[PDB]
Ligand binder design. Structure first.
Ligand SMILES: NC(=O)C1=CN([C@@H]2O[C@H](COP(=O)(O)OP(=O)(O)OC[C@H]3O[C@@H](n4cnc5c(N)ncnc54)[C@H](OP(=O)(O)O)[C@@H]3O)[C@@H](O)[C@H]2O)C=CC1
Ligand SMILES: Nc1ncnc2c1ncn2[C@@H]1O[C@H](COP(=O)(O)OP(=O)(O)OC[C@H]2O[C@@H](O)[C@H](O)[C@@H]2O)[C@@H](O)[C@H]1O
Ligand SMILES: Nc1ncnc2c1ncn2[C@@H]1O[C@H](COP(=O)(O)OP(=O)(O)OC[C@H]2O[C@@H](O)[C@H](O)[C@@H]2O)[C@@H](O)[C@H]1O
Lengths: 359, 174, 378
């Protein structure tokens, strides 16, 4: 039984679905681990590091995937419509585990189904305590929240902390985090430890206590509490927007009228830019300046932390796969009664099986 | 049916310990009790007691929630341990000082198959001589289930705010 | 009595030698403060805020400097030879206060001398306690220390802090700061803030205690040779090749585990000492980052190139020029305050005039030329 991990071919993707640690666990389970040469370079994982953990290096993607019964990768495989038929490289009857984007990308699900590949879309992992260790949404977005603050501090022309010096005092940076999910919470924590004053807002009620549990202040006081948001936004140096709703466009939280009222030198980090942005002035993969405000909209923020993101992603993959390996006969049998298997399996043995995708 | 306790009671128990494992959780963050917690550790370590911290991978409400707050209170990394390297030490622990944690310690995770937390690895705080829970009420954690340990014979509940309790616990000590 | 502040024209310079606060103080001393239009854009200081503080806005650089009998600048004036003759815009007889770089830029000194301009070089501020408030080197380098960590974190593909997570533990980053002067202390503090384990080293013995009080661990190399390391002004000296090998060996243990190396070491009047050779970067982990803050002075790492990020041996070597200007909106108000503190004691109140007391060692050590005569031995 062979498992294979190719290089990520999508522009700007530097993560890889493997680490030296996870290679050791896979060989211990009975797998022959194969990975394409150069696959981990973006994540600071050399070919030498993988071989030392028990992996074999294939020189091309085709050779890596040719005989593999299990395929791990981070982003969904490219189809022939995208100009590079990666699904054709995957062996017929094989198992694929990755961030598939299955509900918004039916064509890749169809194409895999033609080759009778069983595909598990990791983003559809059920939200149960048992599966927190298998959850790629949490692990990857957490590092994005951290990154958002590092990117904000880089683009900002003042220091985050207050500094009392012989020449005078410079005040702290003021940060406003919109959306207090996983990314939002880590952004608050990273902003606060750097010495910034940190405000936050969110529609969910329980989140106020979460903001306060990191030393942030929640923006509080008929629907016009946008006044209270504006009052803080006008004083804000870095605004980090993290609000999304899967399968839908991101909600507009900072309008253009709102950015005109911000002070010059201010920056907005729009982490929701791939779903249309929480700010309409944001543009994928660009830093635009409007009304004296930098609106930063990098794509694939987890890949900006590829070297920590890759070990975590591969561990999520490992935690998902491990319960289904029976060494008694060196095979994987994915138990169907397992909620993690049924909730995540999109197609199997030449037919689509997920309720949301079936015709 | 719960063996309740106070600041004075809890201070005897830890001062007469060769080893104490602190188990921080969400409630510790809500109370912002990490400064007073590390304060309690300094007084324990000064007596010659061995102090460590047991960090469950999902303590709090975000990844590294306990880490950033402990780092803010200046607790050294060498004292902080992840679940997998500290779970066996609970056998050798006289007390498990559970401060604002709950789901993270709940044994229904490996006993009750119909439980929401079933399959989630937990910190084995019950292996210690005694367990001290700091929390305001008998209310559940995030998962919304009761914890058998609360009404266990070798458990002591410290009902109150985590910062205030710990501050008061430091006072009873010297 | 007019004081004027033009916009900085040198490529990449976003700082400005003024702030609203400092304008108010200057008006109270009896100055008409004239700032060039748009001069504070890079420092996020608007024309309107300067105006509200009591300044007049001038449309061009020449128009701002025309009637100004004192001028404040960040970097030295460009000469005709450099592209645009700013020295020519300055009125004859006026006094110029700026980061002049007088010792390594004699051409600008004579050009100012030819126009009878009294020039005060702020980098030559004497090393005395009472002049700390006037010291532009410490105010700017302190912020460069902060910025080095932000630049390191930005180029680094991992996170700084330890985080225990359901997907596993992300370990803390390991940072090593070479040279613990003003910039190095702030680098340690900022790395510590972000959750890094911080190592540091320096030739001066007094620095070990400073590192330890910030929560860092000091790398001792030569206990005896570190005692006679400081000088009269609190600076290091040329240690020699023997100590350089001793240092490289002791450092190796941590440098092979180091994720971010920040080098800040300077020696007055000399090239920056080599602390991380090309051979030492061969031993560093892939994805590691070196921030060479001494790059304009030669570099603590010879692979550094000014204004560029070099990639070699799987290691990013970063050598941004003018690091203080990467924090221009904090650097500017502090630079403006350095100048104010230097100028304030010499303002003769009830004559609305500026008499720079010659007996003051703050004035004597700083002055490079006056009334058409180069005064300071150089
Ligand atoms: N870490 C993460 O990224 C994620 C974690 N979770 C879940 O959250 C849970 C975290 O576990 P754990 O850390 O034990 O937290 P829990 O929610 O299980 O327990 C927290 C306890 O703290 C107490 N508490 C709350 N406020 C205070 C206060 N001010 N002073 C003293 N005590 C207080 C509460 O009791 P009382 O009200 O009586 O005081 C409560 O029982 C897990 O179930 C995990 O799966 C969910 C999503 C993300
Ligand atoms: N118009 C809006 N205004 C403000 N916030 C919004 C809006 N629309 C959505 N949000 C917020 O944006 C958020 C961040 O984006 P998500 O990727 O959806 O966060 P996610 O990690 O998927 O959900 C939060 C999860 O993490 C835990 O903290 C918590 O237990 C919860 O299960 C959510 O917290 C949500 O409340
Ligand atoms: N080979 C070397 N190895 C290690 N450190 C070196 C070396 N050569 C110089 N240094 C160190 O590099 C330093 C940083 O550069 P400088 O700008 O020259 O130092 P500076 O910021 O001016 O600090 C000097 C003064 O300020 C106070 O912080 C401190 O009390 C000290 O007296 C000094 O701290 C110095 O000890």
């Amino acid at each position: 039984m062979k498992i294979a991990i190719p290089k990520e071919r999508r522009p700007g993707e530097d993560r890889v679905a493997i680490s030296p640690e996870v290679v050791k666990k896979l060989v211990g389970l009975g797998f022959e681990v194969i990975v394409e040469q150069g696959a981990g370079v973006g994540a600071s994982i050399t070919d030498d590091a993988l071989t030392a953990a028990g992996a074999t290096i294939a020189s091309t993607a085709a050779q890596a995937l040719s005989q593999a019964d299990v395929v791990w990768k981070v982003q969904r495989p490219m189809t022939a419509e995208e100009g590079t038929d990666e699904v054709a490289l995957i062996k017929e009857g094989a198992v694929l585990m990755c961030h598939l984007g299955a509900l918004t990308n039916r064509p890749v699900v169809e194409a895999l189904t033609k080759r009778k590949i069983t595909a598990y879309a990791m983003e559809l992992m059920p939200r149960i305590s048992r599966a927190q260790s298998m959850d790629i949404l949490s692990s990857q977005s957490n590092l994005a929240g951290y990154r958002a603050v590092i990117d904000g501090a880089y683009e900002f022309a003042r220091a985050f902390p207050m500094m009392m010096t012989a020449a005078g005092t410079v005040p702290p940076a003021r940060v406003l985090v919109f959306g207090v999910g996983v990314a939002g919470l880590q952004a608050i924590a990273t902003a606060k430890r750097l010495g910034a004053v940190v405000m936050a807002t969110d529609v969910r009620a329980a989140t106020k206590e979460q903001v306060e549990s990191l030393g942030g202040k929640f923006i509080t006081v008929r629907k016009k509490q946008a006044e209270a948001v504006l009052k803080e936004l006008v004083k804000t140096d870095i605004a980090i927007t993290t609000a999304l709703i899967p399968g839908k466009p991101a909600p507009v939280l900072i309008t253009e009228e709102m950015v005109t009222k911000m002070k010059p030198g201010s920056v907005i980090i729009d982490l929701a830019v791939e779903a249309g942005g929480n700010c309409p002035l944001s543009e994928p993969g660009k830093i635009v300046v409007k009304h004296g405000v930098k609106i930063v909209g990098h794509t694939n923020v987890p890949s900006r932390v590829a070297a920590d993101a890759s070990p975590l992603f591969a561990k999520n993959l490992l935690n998902f796969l491990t319960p289904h390996v029976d060494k008694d006969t060196k095979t994987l049998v994915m138990k169907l009664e397992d909620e993690t298997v049924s909730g995540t399996c999109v197609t199997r043995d030449g037919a689509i099986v997920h309720p949301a995708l079936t015709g | 049916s719960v063996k309740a306790g106070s600041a004075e009671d809890a201070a005897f128990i830890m001062k007469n310990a060769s080893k104490v494992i602190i188990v921080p959780g969400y409630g510790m963050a809500v109370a912002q009790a990490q400064h007073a917690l590390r304060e309690m550790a300094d007084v324990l370590k000064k007596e010659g007691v061995e102090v460590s911290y047991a960090i469950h991978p999902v303590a709090g409400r975000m990844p590294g929630h306990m880490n950033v707050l402990l780092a803010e209170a200046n607790v050294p990394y060498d004292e902080v341990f992840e679940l997998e390297e500290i779970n066996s030490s609970f056998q050798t622990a006289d007390v498990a000082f559970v401060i604002g944690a709950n789901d993270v310690t709940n044994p229904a995770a490996k006993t009750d198959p119909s439980s929401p937390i079933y399959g989630m690895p937990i910190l084995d705080v019950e292996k210690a001589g005694t367990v001290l829970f700091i929390k305001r009420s008998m209310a559940s954690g995030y998962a919304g289930v009761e914890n058998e340990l609360f009404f266990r014979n070798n458990t002591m509940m410290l009902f109150g705010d985590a910062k205030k309790m710990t501050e008061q616990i430091v006072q009873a000590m010297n």
